[PDB]
Amino acid sequence: SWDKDVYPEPPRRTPAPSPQTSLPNPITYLTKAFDLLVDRPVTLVREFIERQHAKNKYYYYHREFRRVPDITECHEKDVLCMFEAEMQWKRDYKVDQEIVNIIQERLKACQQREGESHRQNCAKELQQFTQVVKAYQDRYHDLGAHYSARKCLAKQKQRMLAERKATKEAA
Amino acid sequence: SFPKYEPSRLASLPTTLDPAEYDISSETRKAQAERLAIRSRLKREYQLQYNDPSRRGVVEDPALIRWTCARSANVYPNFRPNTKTSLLGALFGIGPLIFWYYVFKTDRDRKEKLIQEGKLDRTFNISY
Amino acid sequence: DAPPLTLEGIKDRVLYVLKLYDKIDPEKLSVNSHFMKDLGLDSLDQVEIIMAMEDEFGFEIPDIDAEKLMCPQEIVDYIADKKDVYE
Amino acid sequence: FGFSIVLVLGSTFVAYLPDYRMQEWARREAERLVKYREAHGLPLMESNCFDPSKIQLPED
Amino acid sequence: GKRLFIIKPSGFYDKRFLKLLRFYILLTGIPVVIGITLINVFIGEAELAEIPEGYVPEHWEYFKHPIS
Amino acid sequence: SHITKDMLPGPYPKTPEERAAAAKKYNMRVEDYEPYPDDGMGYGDYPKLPDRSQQERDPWYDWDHPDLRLNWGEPMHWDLDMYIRNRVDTSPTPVNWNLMCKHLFGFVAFMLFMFWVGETYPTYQPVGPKQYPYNNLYLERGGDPNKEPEPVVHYEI
Amino acid sequence: MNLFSSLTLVTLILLTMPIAAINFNTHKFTNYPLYVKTTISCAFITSMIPTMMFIH
Amino acid sequence: MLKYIIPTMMLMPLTWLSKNSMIWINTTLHSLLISLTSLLLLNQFGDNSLNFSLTFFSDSLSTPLLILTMWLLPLMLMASQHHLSKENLARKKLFISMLILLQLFLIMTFTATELIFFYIMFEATLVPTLIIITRWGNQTERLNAGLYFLFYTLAGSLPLLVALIYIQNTMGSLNFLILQYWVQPMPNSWSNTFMWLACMMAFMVKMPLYGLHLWLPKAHVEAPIAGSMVLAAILLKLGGYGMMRITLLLNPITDFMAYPFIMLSLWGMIMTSSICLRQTDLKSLIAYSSVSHMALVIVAILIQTPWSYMGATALMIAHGLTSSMLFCLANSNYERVHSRTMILARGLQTLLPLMAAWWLLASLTNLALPPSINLIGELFVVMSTFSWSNITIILMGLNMVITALYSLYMLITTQRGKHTHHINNILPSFTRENALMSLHMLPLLLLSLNPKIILGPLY
Amino acid sequence: NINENNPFLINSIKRLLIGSLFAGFIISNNIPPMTIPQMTMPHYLKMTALTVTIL
Amino acid sequence: SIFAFTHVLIPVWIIHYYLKYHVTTKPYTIVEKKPRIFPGDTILETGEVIPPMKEFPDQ
Amino acid sequence: GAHLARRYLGDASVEPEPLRMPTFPPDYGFPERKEREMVATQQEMNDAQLVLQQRDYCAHYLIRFLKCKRDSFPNFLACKHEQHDWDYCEHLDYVKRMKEFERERRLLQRKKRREQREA
Amino acid sequence: FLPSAAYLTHQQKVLQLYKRALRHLESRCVHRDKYRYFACLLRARFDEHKNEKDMVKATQLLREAEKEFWHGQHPQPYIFPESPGGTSYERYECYKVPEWCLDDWHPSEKAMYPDYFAKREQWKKLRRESWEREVKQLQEETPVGGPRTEALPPARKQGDLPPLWWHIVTRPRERP
């Protein structure tokens, strides 16, 4: 299955039409015909294959990692600390990209569901999108391509120094 | 009647209003006869070597070889650096490059000042 | 787009539209006649004949073959060359 | 030995292979983390990725 | 009787190359696809357990497809 | 094979014999050989032709190359790559070239000028705005779920 | 409704059988125009349905 | 990695103690086996590269180019007969063993660790190519072509050694992690300007850039087919690969001093696309095509986006395959007629009717077919450079138009319109040529199906 | 050699004149309404289509 | 019958076999745009009546 | 139309410009003329996915038209009464917009020329 | 620009003017009966002054007629759809495969088509059979050391075929 906590679906809405026709009803006969022509034999072959999969079952796990000390807690150069620190940072960068992918997929799903009036019960997901992406824009954006982790920490120090000067001129 | 069809470096001049062809003298008759003689001898030699079934290769135009070896290798001799050649070269080698160089300087200076004030469209400009 | 054409049929069609042209006498219409020699009609009328050929049959014959047909036998031979009139 | 043991074997080898630079693992890792930060109150993807207790600045 | 004789450049070399190409891909095109079919119809792909209490696996057992 | 005398070393001097040798080797008349001249742009001493040469040359001559317009011995003007049919059509024009570019530039500027006249002088049909119902159709514009309801109503007219 | 997706994707995939078939053929089809015409006609009759479902 | 190096050594005495009509099958079969063996490499994961020793390591910048090398060898080997197959057996053995030594130092070069080792194996890549192109160049100016080749590449790539020795004995060792993890952003004095210009100008000479692009075309029109494919594909994308390796240091001052190289590369791409439109001698068209694509790669490297690096290496692999294929079709045409010219052999849709399909497919993949790898490359390069500056899209699009035009003219000049009906020695298509076309164009379309392999280190 | 007694051509022309007679009305009429049908014209503004054709 | 039999039964079977299990184990996948409910109706699935449309006059 | 020729050739003073219409203030010749029932059930207008610029006056007639077209779909030529009724309602709305235009036009002409031709 | 002379002549030049003017009048005039009228008016207008024995007056009026033709021609004249310029222009060149090939086949297909290939073999045996003597004897004997024409005389003397006939007779059919 898939976790519906992280992949939210809105609850279903389905009207009940009832003609008020006398042609009557081509597509009703045709959807019953499609059901009895495709939906039964594919499911019978799939039941055969599901018994064959129920002969014996493998398992795969989710890969688990520990926590490194820091990049802020290593020594001067001393590579065999910073290597571990920066690989943990690189995995944070990878999972952060996948977080942004998840938020963008949720937004596209909201667009296709909610019809031509976009601005009703999609504005909340648009707001959380602008939240997370303003964070990512100020965090990981302007660093070029020859990063390891050190340019990110330099950006971090520079930005919080900018905030310190900002509250210095403010108060 | 007609404004006489001034030609151009694109417009061809058709055979009617030349008006040099209708200035017939013995020069033109003799030169056209010798031009027919030259085309006669060339097509004669070509049709001689053109029909041999014993032959297998191609007929090997020397004019094709000549034009290619002129236009490929024999461009560099001869040459002297003339003011015509040197000025035309300094215009066609440096000019457009220094031009779009200046426009990259101007556009980047505008963009760097606009992001130095920070009033850019990087509300969400992630894919840099 | 394929009519089965032959020498005899297109020979008769060329001779037919030569005969249909009025000011030459159809009594003295041999295939081995000549459009200047034995019937005496001028070369301008021969170019009228040329345009009659090209409007019946729908293909140009060029300026290099405008001087040098001058008789219906060579017209039939030149058309049989140009259209390749065989089965 | 140029197609029938090369091309189709390479087609099998690159048609499926493990998570090359961690695709499926990154999918499930981001799913677990968004589940955590939506079932635990704080907003997902806190900015300022380093802990500001773990930082120092040259003063004015 | 009616029909002329068409001119053709060559056919034998080209038909020979195409039959050789499709056949020498077909020689291990069919067994490979039947192999991947029997793999995902007999042995299973996998299922999705979690890591139990202190049982550390090998570097494998982390992947969906069994040939992976 | 091939001898270096069949390439083209140097220009037209000296004046009798080099013109003679170029006309012998390039299969041309003596006075019809007319070089560029020695301009300093390289160019050897290759011949010069009347430059159009490809929607010229009536094909009822039936020379050898039916679409390359060769004759196996013609000197083949230096810009022959640009000349071949499917690259550049140097046909004799039906009217002019100056008269055509005059009328085309005048017609295009004329149409864009009437367009500018249109851009400052619009038409419409005489009727007020579409009266949108609820605060200029609020909540379905840019956002604002409770932030800024900006009040306006309509009157039965 | 998986009916709609199934009919639309087979209107796509019907226009993959002819080209792949004669790439895999290496033979002379004499009714190959007939074959292209009938696969286009069957593609029409499989694409006529889900539009009717759409406005329905 | 020595499991790749040492069988390519041991493949050499195969050709020595194999007899007449028996060197051939052994070399071809066993190099295809080694191609399987390096198809086995692809193990790359997650945190970093794969270290194959204290001595070797494999990036994801390195893996597709290494696969390209060990796959382009046997294609080249079957490609390079009938121009020396009638010749002598000892000279044939010398030729094939020379190519194997060439491949060996290419693998040495691509899987380098310290940049000194990279430089030694760089000019070890250089030296067999010289002897190959000069000994079988088969035209009167192969002399001058090889001489310009060696003097340009050495004289450009001479001070790169001095800068590498300097960075060695001022900032420690030269493995890519300790080349990384320690390198400070270097300030803008004029000494730093010279060191940056030394490294980058050496590789500018290698690619070529437009300022020294006349390095190339003599050494492509006056080289045999093995040396041609080696030169174009493996040497130019090797130069780009070396640039990508070295450009991690000196990143702060490159925004100050990188502005003229972008301009020279852009206007050179425009002028090179213009010059490959009107030339005769069909072989030269592919050479200036290569100069155009490598100018686009150079723009892509001196802008520093991960988009730009992914698109750069994709464009590398795509034009390597396309130019190598199109060189092999030019060799097909020259085996047909002993011409080297362009306007001579026309027609050829009738004659060899399936040669049309491979010329069409080569001109499509040069044409940036929209799921091909070439359009992937040019697309990400144009995206990154429009992120760089908003006005540089015009030159890219004029490049696109002229690229499509010269590719179409190269297609329909030789193989369209009217057979000259005096050739009468062309033969129908061999099985060899269509086999070589099929060996080019199946992996390109397969990588078009799933390109999650060939994008860069910043995937 | 003017021949048109061809079953394929008469079938195809027949079917496309059916498509040029009924199918425009059929495709046009059961559209989902997404735009505003204007329909509110003065004199000599709606008449001008037929006026242009006749003139 | 075998001709149109294979051409309209084999691809529909394989595509609908493709459009259950793979298409649901890829979670964010084929998504419908919602049926436009109208006020004189009821939801077919759960079941409650939408109150119909309000005051009609001034027509 | 002819009004456009008059607006361009004559005085540009007395002419109200479209899309910058409201000049004279409200409750002027109005007073106590506003009901604006608008019984379209705006939440049901939101729930039923209706188009922008169809979220306007005479909405419920469009609601009924869509309801009958959904109820009798293979009846291809059934809903024409409600079609014509909805057309009639928004024709009345166009009449209302026309009258609002000409009322402001008469106001601007008569008021401005009374003031600036007697004062 | 012809095999048989250097210049064309005066009379055929006037004749080319007549034929092009007649063609452009076809192009100008639809409905064909008023075309026949205008054509006869053109025939009389050219038959105004045939009897002028002056040469320079005749070519002056010829150049004036060229001016009047050039100002009065049609932009898209009715060209024939087999001529160059027209619609066909080697339209069916797709199957104009040259006949020097068709012999580089596999002999399986030569076993399929036996009798045509036997007759082609005896064509080529006639070609080599009557190749050297009469052809190259008349080529190096009957012209002058400057041959100064393009056409060749037939091998009328004693025996075999008129020289250089292979690529003139054995050519494709222009409508396969």
UniProtKB/Swiss-Prot annotation, chain H:
User: Keywords of this protein's UniProt record, alphabetized?
Assistant: Electron transport, Membrane, Mitochondrion, Mitochondrion inner membrane, NAD, Respiratory chain, Translocase, Transmembrane, Transmembrane helix, Transport, Ubiquinone
Q: What is its EC number?
A: 7.1.1.2
Determine the domain of life of the protein's source. Eukaryota
Q: Where are the transmembrane segments?
A: 22-42, 60-80, 98-118, 147-167, 196-216, 224-244, 256-276, 284-303, 308-330, 351-371, 391-411
The record's disulfide annotation reads: none
Q: How does it sit in the membrane?
A: Multi-pass membrane protein
| Pfam family, any one | Oxidored_q5_N
Give a GO biological-process term: electron transport coupled proton transport
* Main location per the UniProt record: mitochondrion
Enzyme class, spelled out: translocase
Where is it localised? Mitochondrion inner membrane
PANTHER family documented for this protein: NADH-UBIQUINONE OXIDOREDUCTASE CHAIN 4 (PTHR43507:SF20)
Q: What does this protein do?
A: Core subunit of the mitochondrial membrane respiratory chain NADH dehydrogenase (Complex I) which catalyzes electron transfer from NADH through the respiratory chain, using ubiquinone as an electron acceptor. Essential for the catalytic activity and assembly of complex I.
Its family remark reads: Belongs to the complex I subunit 4 family.
Q: Kindly provide the name given to this protein in its UniProt entry.
A: NADH-ubiquinone oxidoreductase chain 4
Q: Which organism is it from?
A: Ovis aries (Sheep)
UniProtKB/Swiss-Prot annotation, chain I:
TM region positions: 16-36
Domain of life of the native organism: Eukaryota
Compartments where located = Mitochondrion inner membrane
The record's note on quaternary structure and interaction partners says:
Core subunit of respiratory chain NADH dehydrogenase (Complex I) which is composed of 45 different subunits.
**Family affiliation:** Belongs to the complex I subunit 5 family.
Function, in words = Core subunit of the mitochondrial membrane respiratory chain NADH dehydrogenase (Complex I) which catalyzes electron transfer from NADH through the respiratory chain, using ubiquinone as an electron acceptor. Essential for the catalytic activity and assembly of complex I.
Q: What is this protein called?
A: NADH-ubiquinone oxidoreductase chain 5
Taxonomy, top ranks, is: Eukaryota, Metazoa, Chordata, Craniata, Vertebrata
Whole sequence portion shown: 442 to 496 of 606
